[PDB]
Amino acid sequence: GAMIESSTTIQVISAGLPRTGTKSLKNALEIIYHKPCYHMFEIIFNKQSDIIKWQNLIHDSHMITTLTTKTIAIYDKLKELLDGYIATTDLPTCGFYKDLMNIYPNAKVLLTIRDKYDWLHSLRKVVLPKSNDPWKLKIEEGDKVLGLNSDFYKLTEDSLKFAFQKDDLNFDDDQVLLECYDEYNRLVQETVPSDRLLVLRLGDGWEPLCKFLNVEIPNGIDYPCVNSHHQMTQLTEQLIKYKSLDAIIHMFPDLI
Ligand SMILES: Nc1ncnc2c1ncn2[C@@H]1O[C@H](COP(=O)(O)O)[C@@H](OP(=O)(O)O)[C@H]1O
Ligand SMILES: CC(C)NC[C@H]1CCc2cc(CO)c([N+](=O)[O-])cc2N1
């Protein structure tokens, strides 16, 4: 197909929850658009100063009405955070999908989904281990190597609670999490006009995504398959062993 000059503004809003293929999708959108896509990895590796800005935004977000003066202030901060990016995926952004749709009226919406039990299992190994899981101590040790402190964990928890619209949340309760998951995904498909939504099940690959976005399938490039919990476990253990990211980053080419 012909090469056309794409606008550097949010073109795709992904509502999918963490551990549903968001990093592969991030990589895929960057392969298509040749501009950055927002993701929790963007915060961790490139923009840790954003952490307090997202935390502030979530704090102020109860005061959003579907427009109040207070809404415009929030929308302005969201636009600021996302300047220069062509898409959003993952926490903390995914819970803001309705507001992003208002801010970027010409952006299309994605929902990444998968088997709820596979999701929970993945979440417990990477994002939200149970309190008494010994692996939690390893995650915390590796996170310190990355410069991540208590504020980072607060942002993760608060952004999840925001996505699920819960004032609080027993993170150690599998049944609660499974029910939030199903309710979240249900609500997205009820809220977004079907014309503006594409639901992507893990494994779907390039084809429905590229059709939805009116772009050619990238020539000779397989759809990304990254960020497995097995790989994240290896990253954690290597961070602990070497005590720096730059010592090991050559070992994790497409993940980081
Ligand atoms: N192209 C693909 N096909 C199948 N699974 C994929 C995939 N890309 C990512 N995944 C899976 O999606 C999860 C990562 O999601 P995220 O990037 O949102 O955190 C991982 O699940 P597992 O932890 O079960 O391996 C990963 O294996
Ligand atoms: C020990 C290291 C590997 N921990 C990985 C980092 C970096 C990867 C990571 C990703 C997410 C979600 O995309 C979350 N999260 O929302 O809790 C946390 C983290 N933490």
Q: Report the CATH number at residue 122.
A: 3.40.50.300
Token digits for 128? 């939200």
CA 126 – ligand 2 centroid, Å? 6
- List Cα–Cα distances, 34 to 5, 28, 49, 80, in angstroms: 11, 10, 24, 20
Token digits for 30? 């960057």
Q: Is 196 in the pocket of ligand 1 (CB under 6 A)?
A: no
Distance CA 110, CA 107 (A): 10
Diameter over CA atoms, the chain:
55
In this structure, which long-range contacts are made by residues 114-119, counting pairs with CB atoms below 8 Å and at least 24 apart in sequence? Answer: 114/19, 114/20, 114/21, 114/201, 114/202, 116/178, 116/181, 116/182, 117/178, 119/17, 119/19, 119/20, 119/181
Distance CA 50, CA 120 (A): 27
Residue by residue, DSSP assigns 198-233 as EEEETT--HHHHHHHHT-PPPTT-PPP----HHHHH
Residue 160 CA: which ligand is closest? 2
Distance CA 186, CA 17 (A): 12
**Nearest protein Cα to ligand 2, atom 15:** 127
Which segments of the chain are extended strands (E)?
12-14, 37-38, 87-88, 108-113, 197-201
Owning domain of residue 4: 1-256
Nearest partner of 78 among 144, 13, 22, 123, judged by Cα = 13
Assign residue 217 a region: left if phi > 0, alpha if psi is -120 to 50, beta otherwise? beta
Exposure b/e, 65-97, CB count within 10 A at least 16 = b: eeeeeebeebbeebeebbeebbbbbbbbbbbbb
Q: Is 100 in the pocket of ligand 2 (CB under 6 A)?
A: no
Q: Are 118 and 91 in contact (CB under 8 A)?
A: no
Nearest partner of 64 among 76, 52, 80, judged by Cα = 76
Q: Which of 177, 232, 233 has the most ligand 2 atoms within 8 A of CB, as the residue to mutate? A: 232
Residue 17 CA: which ligand is closest? 1
Q: Is 120 in the pocket of ligand 1 (CB under 6 A)?
A: no
Q: Is 233 in the pocket of ligand 1 (CB under 6 A)?
A: no
Token digits for 192? 């977004």
Distance CA 136, CA 125 (A): 9
Nearest partner of 65 among 77, 55, 74, judged by Cα = 74
3-state percent breakdown (helix, strand, coil) of the chain, nearest 5: 55, 5, 40
Structure-token match 């290597």, residue found:
238
Q: Is 8 in the pocket of ligand 1 (CB under 6 A)?
A: no
Q: What is the position in ligand 2's atom list of the atom closest to the CA of 153?
A: 17
Strands 37-38 and 12-14: unpaired
**Domain total of the chain:** 1
Q: Is 14 in the pocket of ligand 1 (CB under 6 A)?
A: no
- Tell me the chain's radius of gyration from C-alpha atoms: 18
Token digits for 5? 């000059």
